[PDB]
């Protein structure tokens, strides 16, 4: 679960590069821009994201970046197609992203899809109150069950409604008349009597007979078949009614579960509000030291409508570098260098999620004791997992167990970059050079005292 080898072809100032790199703390010095191109832009390409053609070699047709830990690759073509690869063949970019975000971490705006988005932001806090979080997850799942069951009631609703109105209509039509078999046969006789004789009951008799005739034509034919059909209608209607009522009860129950999920969400919110104070104070104590003092930081929860996926409360993080910033979004507002450092602190104090992480543009706006604190932190983390960084500062470049130098060799008839490992005395020489100028007994001495 770590990086091992890196092959880059026709990228910017690079005319094919094969680097067998170990782990631990790897520092890149010399040509800092070239290093940024190697570690941020290229590794950036493997993690996915936008793919600007400017990254492509000056006078070349297409570039390629292969990494070996499983061997992922990314090829960009000025033609317009290019291709992404995982371990074997042509795979999807979305899948490249999903896979590599599990292996690589580049810190910067691209850090958003690492430690910075809503799910991992919430996770930092949610792994301090697992009980409440699982309680929410459970309530939400059961509620989703309820909603699933609850929807077939619409399918039933649309048709069963009209059908039921029909049934009831028929049943009432029959009920009002209240037909009875073996009635017309005598009715006809009585009619024979009344008409043959030849006034009050006559029209009542005729009316009843005609009624039996209509109701006979309706759901008949048989006088019995009518009442039969009425019974069938009664039954069906009863059943459908059972369905509906049942659905209703289930619905009320669902609302109850809703109330429950609400309560749980509230409890979780309280848990957060409780675990907020001790959390932030543990970071500032280490962040205000790595330069940037008087920094303010807090967590703010939003009252979002509904239950949602994680919770009815959104987890937001507010931060301010200066006493006049007024706080605000961690990234996407008041960002730059401080973010990478914050990422570092958070990392060491909490832990590393990916095999190899990289911090970009961190060693800026700072210097001195602070710089040494950041470097030392890079060490602390170096033990756990592999860390990459392009530095120009001396203590930082020295503290890195491994040290890669980025120089520039000219290959006819072009000028190219060229990186190499530092054997020992060479390393000391170059790092001393970094501190102060060139080679000097004082520089060598101080360097040896620092690297110790």
UniProtKB/Swiss-Prot annotation:
A Gene Ontology molecular function term of the record: ATP binding
Residues at which ATP binds: 30-37
One BP term from GO: SOS response
Signal peptide: none
Record-level GO cellular component terms: bacterial nucleoid
Alphabetized Gene3D superfamilies for the sequence: P-loop containing nucleotide triphosphate hydrolases
This protein's UniProt keywords: ATP-binding, DNA damage, DNA repair, Nucleotide-binding
Pfam families: SMC_N
Function, in words: May be involved in recombinational repair of damaged DNA.
Similarity comment text for this entry: Belongs to the RecN family.
Protein name, entry field: DNA repair protein RecN
Natural source organism: Deinococcus radiodurans (strain ATCC 13939 / DSM 20539 / JCM 16871 / CCUG 27074 / LMG 4051 / NBRC 15346 / NCIMB 9279 / VKM B-1422 / R1)
């Amino acid at each position: 679960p770590r990086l091992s080898r890196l092959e880059i072809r026709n990228l910017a100032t690079i005319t094919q590069l094969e680097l067998e790199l170990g782990g631990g703390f790897c520092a890149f010095t010399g040509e800092t821009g070239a290093g940024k191109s190697i570690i941020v832009d290229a590794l950036g390409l493997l993690l996915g994201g936008r793919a600007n053609h400017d990254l492509i070699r000056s006078g070349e047709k297409e570039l390629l970046v292969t990494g070996f830990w499983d061997s992922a690759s990314r090829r960009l073509s000025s033609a317009g197609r290019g291709a992404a690869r995982l371990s074997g063949e042509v795979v999807s970019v979305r899948e490249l992203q999903e896979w590599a975000q599990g292996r690589l971490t580049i810190h910067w705006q691209h850090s958003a899809v690492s430690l910075l988005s809503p799910a991992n932001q919430r996770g930092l806090l949610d792994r301090r109150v697992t009980k409440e979080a699982q309680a929410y997850a459970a309530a939400h799942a059961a509620w989703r069950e309820a909603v699933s069951r609850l929807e077939r009631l619409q399918a039933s609703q649309r048709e069963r409604a009209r059908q039921i109105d029909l049934l009831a209509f028929q049943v009432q039509e029959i009920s009002e008349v209240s037909p009875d078999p073996g009635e017309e046969e005598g009715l006809n006789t009585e009619l024979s009597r009344l008409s043959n004789l030849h006034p009050e009951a006559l029209d009542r008799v005729e009316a009843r007979l005609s009624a039996l005739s209509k109701l006979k034509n309706k759901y008949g034919p048989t006088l019995e078949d009518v009442v039969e059909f009425g019974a069938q209608a009664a039954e069906e209607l009863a059943g459908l009614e059972e369905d509906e009522r049942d659905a209703g009860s289930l619905q009320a129950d669902v609302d109850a579960l809703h109330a429950e999920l609400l309560k749980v969400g509230q409890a979780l919110d309280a848990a957060r509000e409780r675990e907020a104070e001790p959390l932030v104070d543990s970071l500032l104590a280490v962040i205000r030291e790595l330069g940037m003092p008087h920094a303010r930081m807090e967590f703010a929860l939003s009252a979002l409508a509904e239950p949602a996926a994680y919770g009815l409360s959104d987890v937001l993080l507010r931060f301010s570098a200066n006493p006049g910033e007024e706080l605000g979004p961690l990234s996407d507002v008041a960002s730059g260098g401080e973010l990478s450092r914050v990422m570092l602190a958070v990392s060491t104090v909490l832990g590393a999620d990916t095999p190899s992480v990289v911090f970009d543009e961190v060693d800026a706006g700072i210097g001195g004791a602070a710089a040494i604190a950041v470097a030392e932190q890079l060490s602390r983390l170096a033990d756990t997992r592999q860390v990459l960084v392009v530095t120009h500062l001396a203590q930082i470049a020295a503290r890195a167990h491994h040290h890669y130098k980025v120089e520039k060799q000219v290959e006819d008839g072009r000028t190219v970059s060229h990186v190499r490992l530092l054997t020992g005395d060479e390393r000391l020489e170059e790092i001393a050079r970094m501190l102060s100028g060139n080679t000097s007994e004082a520089a060598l001495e101080h360097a040896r005292e620092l690297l110790a």
